Amino acid sequence: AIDLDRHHVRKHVSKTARGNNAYMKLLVRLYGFLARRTQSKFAKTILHRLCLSRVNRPIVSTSKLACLMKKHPEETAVCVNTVTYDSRYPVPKMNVCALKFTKTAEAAITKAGGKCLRFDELALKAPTGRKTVLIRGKRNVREALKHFGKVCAKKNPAKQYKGKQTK
Amino acid sequence: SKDKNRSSHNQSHKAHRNGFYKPKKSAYMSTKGMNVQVLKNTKAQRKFALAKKLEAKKAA
Amino acid sequence: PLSNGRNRRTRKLFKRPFRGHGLSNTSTILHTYKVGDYVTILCNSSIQHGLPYKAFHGKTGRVWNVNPHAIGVMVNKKVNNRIVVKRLHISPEHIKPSGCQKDFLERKAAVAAIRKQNIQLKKEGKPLLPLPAKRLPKQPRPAELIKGADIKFTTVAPLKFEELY
Amino acid sequence: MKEYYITARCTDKAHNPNEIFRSRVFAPNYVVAKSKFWMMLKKQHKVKKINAELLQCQPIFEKNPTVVKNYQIFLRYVSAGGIHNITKQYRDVTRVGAVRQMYNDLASQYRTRQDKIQLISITTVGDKAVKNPVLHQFVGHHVKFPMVHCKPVIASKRFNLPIKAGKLTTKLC
Amino acid sequence: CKARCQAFRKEVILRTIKNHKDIEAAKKAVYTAKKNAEINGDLYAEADPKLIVAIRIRGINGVSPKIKKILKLLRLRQINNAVFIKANASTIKMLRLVDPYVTYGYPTLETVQKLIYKRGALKINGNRMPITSNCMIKKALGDKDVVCVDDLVHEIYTVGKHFKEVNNKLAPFKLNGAKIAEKNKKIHFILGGGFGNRELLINKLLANMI
RNA sequence: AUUGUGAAUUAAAAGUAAAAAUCCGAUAAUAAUGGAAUGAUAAAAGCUAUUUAAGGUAAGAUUAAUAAAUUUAAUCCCGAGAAUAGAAACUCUUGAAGAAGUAAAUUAUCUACCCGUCUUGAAACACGGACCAAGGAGUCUAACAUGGAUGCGAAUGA
RNA sequence: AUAAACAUACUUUGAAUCGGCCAAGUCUGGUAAGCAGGACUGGCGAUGCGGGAUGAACCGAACGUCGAGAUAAAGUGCCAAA
RNA sequence: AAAAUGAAGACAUUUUAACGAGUAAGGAAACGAAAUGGCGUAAGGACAACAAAAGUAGUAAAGAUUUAAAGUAAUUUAGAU
Incomplete structure (x- = not known):
């Protein structure tokens, strides 16, 4: 035979839309077409982020969008994830393109004079991406990450899943 | 029922399947336990430089 | 089956060099170590206090912190299937400056001498010098001609066996 | 078996680079011949391949491969006991031919494989200097013997029939 | 157009x-x-050869880890596989270490020509594409001023400036079988065996192998 | 005490030092003539013919000067690119009186140790198994965690 | 210098497993053992194929279903292809 | 694995390249370029002659015995009694 370091195994990268969502299937069909034809790194990025699992597409709040759009007045924030609403802080005027908008987030963005776009309108208006800012939410804020590891560790102890008689 | 005590057979073959995990770069850059006076000087300048950086931000 | 003492199997490792007993040179305590330097850990049995563990003997490490009496050294240690970072604090008596970068610092200096000439030469507009050639493994030597005027021949043949008794 | 003429020089501190080593090496090819040459240098002059340059390696062809000569070979071989020096004589028309006989003859009479024999020298001796008990009889002028019990010869493999017809016979030949 | x-x-x-x-x-x-x-x-005094062709002689079973790594560094991962190797102190020592598993020597121009023309191939986009045109060679090695198959042959034989990039693009050759040795491949060629440095005699073996 | 052979060496003649045959070295390649396995059928970055001419690095040829030359000059020859024109559609045998293939039985050459399990190792002189049918063994409730799909999101559930 | 993008770095969750055995240009106890125990590596276990008549470990070589060739260990009086 | 094409064709697309041994063990379902592909048993909700009589059945169901066909295989299909 042949002395290979390792045998061929499936590459651990998603290439389609997870689940049976008919609309999310068409979005991947649209951006898989755009990235192949336009050969734009922006469409390759949006296509890749559309294929992540739900846990890997964390939310972005209106407060975080406002901070990132401060020095970008006429721009379009583009986050492939649900956009929630931070009720603690005001929402300025800005245009956001996202997969889904919370009822309160959509009201707040619209009431400020902004716009809530979907990814087909963004591809229709800015296919290769010209006045957009790519944004993704934080991943390590998940509480599940606290318990990972060994809680007896000297350096970075875990968080000891609560249970029988935990003090 | 005497049994074999210990053997290092096949141990190196195991340790190299997933080879020796080198530490990342951040391991070598830790500063815990440095010289006391050196940390004081570094903290003093980082506080001075940050305040100067911040007042310009407040100015504009 | 050895024991688990801190200084086991050190009859030969911790022995002082032949005719090298007593005090050490004063260069050991006078040499100045700076953070980022390369040092070699060399346990000195004559100074029992602060003796580094025998597994670090002869290991080349980097200085990461300099204290009033001790020099912090950062070396690599091998564990089950990984490599960990060990940070120590040894007195200067148990370490020694390392020459691991001795020849590298000559090549760094030679290229700097050429670069300093190149900037000047470009100021006068004259052509600039080329950088020194990189080291190569011993290359196949080229063809050559040998003048036979000063050439002598000695025949080579198997030798008749002679008894050593 | 072929004979080669090999020369080389040593370029280092120990040996001055104005002294050239020569040898005449018998080997099946030039690659084997060079290996014998390098071991002679290494075991007799502390010369190694990594610090020496080969110059020439040319075959030596027999000048008149039609004249019968009595060859004498001085060799040393290693047995179970120790190391001994032997002097065997062969009658052939080529130097490489005589060495081929010597290797075959030593492997049979003494059961010594080739990698125990070092050919010190091979020369040519006179007609009356042959001392081999059997070979001494064929060096005279009036050698004459009837080869009896000849098996009949076959022109080629074409006529090598398995079963023949009629009776069989040898030849007083 | x-x-x-x-x-x-x-x-x-x-x-x-x-x-x-x-x-x-x-x-x-x-x-x-x-x-x-x-x-x-x-x-x-002749110049030492600068080019070496090495053939993997033995299988993939029963190799020490040190030898296993060297044969992977020379891309000799299969029996009856030939590659071209530069000659220097580093490679010659590496070939000595793996001597029982390889036979090697110095090729002639005709040996390089026949190997590249018949068994030549290139790694394009991770695909071992065999050589069929100069356009495919121009695409792969255009940046290295090698635009036809004869530049590929000449560069390998003379070991030019871009030998490493040209040689590393050439996929290891897959060869036929042939009479390996006289006694067996368990002894050095000097003893009449199969492995080891055959010098210019490697061309006779490659003649029956291509 | 006249003569014979003779390795080796030498003179003169012949010889520009490429014939053929054999041996010793070096090689195994281009080609041709017959086949085999898997295919294909189409016209060309086919092949051929006519024009000019990049080239022929020992060696396309003849010459001359000279020569242990892959040393120089001349004029003959051929000729890559390119432009212009040319050409490939076939025979025979067998088959609903059974072709090709496939299946069953028998024969012949090669080939084949008892399944399951414990075990480093069983075809084992290790254990269960006389044969057949039907039944026959990771399920349900409850708590937690990870993970993939789902709704909503400072709320979610009610 | 050489190799490396289906490279590299991983993170999470989890299965089985920790009765082993053999070889040797190796070692210790023993008179010695197809004995007991170890260092390094390759194997058998988990592994069929070609050869050694037969064989867990030896030699070549590791396996999708096939056709044609050149081979390896090793062989060429008949069984048995040469 | 990478390129190309992609509302429906179809054989789970087209091309090129590398690869395919294996005990214990793992790879749940769904995921158009599909994050392994499938066969079988029984029951529940649907669909099954698109023009107002809409799957098969006394012009012979299920079952049983065999003969052939499809599938690498689990199995399926059809004829005869």
Whole structure:
């Protein structure tokens, strides 16, 4: 035979839309077409982020969008994830393109004079991406990450899943 | 029922399947336990430089 | 089956060099170590206090912190299937400056001498010098001609066996 | 078996680079011949391949491969006991031919494989200097013997029939 | 439009003529040096070869980890696989270490020509594409000033400036079977075996192997 | 005490030092003539013919000067690119009186130790198994965690 | 210098497993053992194929279903292809 | 694995390249370029002659015995009694 370091195994990268969502299937069909034809790194990025699992597409709040759009007045924030609403802080005027908008987030963005776009309108208006800012939410804020590891560790102890008689 | 005590057979073959995990770069850059006076000087300048950086931000 | 003492199997490792007993040179305590330097850990049995563990003997490490009496050294240690970072604090008596970068610092200096000439030469507009050639493994030597005027021949043949008794 | 003429020089501190080593090496090819040459240098002059340059390696062809000569070979071989020096004589028309006989003859009479024999020298001796008990009889002028019990010869493999017809016979030949 | 095909064909001829000039001119210079040295009675020392072709002789079973790594560094991962290797202190020591598993020597130009023309291939986009045109060679090695198959042959034989990049693109050759040795492949070629350094005699083996 | 052979060496003649045959070295390649396995059928970056001419690096040829030359000059020859024109559609045998293939039985050459399990190792002189049918063994409730799909999101559930 | 993008760095969750055995240009106890125990590596276990008549470990070589060739260990009086 | 094409064709697309041994063990379902592909048993909700009589059945169901066909295989299909 042949002395290979390792045998061929499936590459651990998603290439389609997870689940049976008919609309999310068409979005991947649209951006898989755009990235192949336009050969734009922006469409390759949006296509890749559309294929992540739900846990890997964390939310972005209106407060975080406002901070990132401060020095970008006429721009379009583009986050492939649900956009929630931070009720603690005001929402300025800005245009956001996202997969889904919370009822309160959509009201707040619209009431400020902004716009809530979907990814087909963004591809229709800015296919290769010209006045957009790519944004993704934080991943390590998940509480599940606290318990990972060994809680007896000297350096970075875990968080000891609560249970029988935990003090 | 005497049994074999210990053997290092096949141990190196195991340790190299997933080879020796080198530490990342951040391991070598830790500063815990440095010289006391050196940390004081570094903290003093980082506080001075940050305040100067911040007042310009407040100015504009 | 050895024991688990801190200084086991050190009859030969911790022995002082032949005719090298007593005090050490004063260069050991006078040499100045700076953070980022390369040092070699060399346990000195004559100074029992602060003796580094025998597994670090002869290991080349980097200085990461300099204290009033001790020099912090950062070396690599091998564990089950990984490599960990060990940070120590040894007195200067148990370490020694390392020459691991001795020849590298000559090549760094030679290229700097050429670069300093190149900037000047470009100021006068004259052509600039080329950088020194990189080291190569011993290359196949080229063809050559040998003048036979000063050439002598000695025949080579198997030798008749002679008894050593 | 072929004979080669090999020369080389040593370029280092120990040996001055104005002294050239020569040898005449018998080997099946030039690659084997060079290996014998390098071991002679290494075991007799502390010369190694990594610090020496080969110059020439040319075959030596027999000048008149039609004249019968009595060859004498001085060799040393290693047995179970120790190391001994032997002097065997062969009658052939080529130097490489005589060495081929010597290797075959030593492997049979003494059961010594080739990698125990070092050919010190091979020369040519006179007609009356042959001392081999059997070979001494064929060096005279009036050698004459009837080869009896000849098996009949076959022109080629074409006529090598398995079963023949009629009776069989040898030849007083 | 497609007028570049004629210009490309002309350009290839110009390169081919130039390459054969360099090979023949260096061949002549050596020949006269030997001739003149004999006239003067002097001694002429030939230059050591700069190119080596190595063939993997044994299987993939029963190899020490040190030997296993070296054969992977030389891309000899299969029995009856030949690659071209530069000659220096590093590689010669590496080939000595794996001597029982390889046989190697110094190829001739005709050996390089036949191997590249018949068994040649290139790694394009991770695909071992066999050589069928100069356009595929121009695409892969255009940045290295190798635009036809004769630049590929000339560069390998003379070991030019871009030998590493050209050689690393050439996929390891897959060869046939042949009579490996006289006794067996368990002894060195010096003893009449199969492995080891065969010097120029590796061309006879490669003749029955290509 | 006249003569014979003779390795080796030498003179003169012949010889520009490429015939053929054999041996010793070096090689194994281009080609041709017959086949085999898997295919294809189409016209060309086929092949051929006519024009000019990049080239022929020991060696396409003849010459001359000279020569242990892959040393120089001349004029003959051929000729790559390119432009212009040319050409490939076939025979025979067998088959609903059974072709090709496939299946069953028998024969012949090669080939084949008892399944399951414990075990480093069983075809084992280790254990269960006389044969057949039907039944026959990771399920349900409850708590937690990870993970993939789902709704909503400072709320979610009610 | 050489190799490396289906490279590299991983993160999470989890299965089985920790009765082993053999070889040797190796070692210790023993008179010695197809004995007991170890260092390094390759194997058998988990592994069929070609050869050694037969064989867990030896030699070549590791396996999708096939056709044609050149081979390896090793062989060429008949069984048995040469 | 990478390129190309992609509302429906179809054989789970087209091309190129590398690869395919294996005990214990793992790879749940769904995921158009599909994050392994499938066969079988029984029951529940649907669909099954698109023009107002809409799957098969006394012009012979299920079952049983065999003969052939499809599938690498689990199995399926059809004829005869």
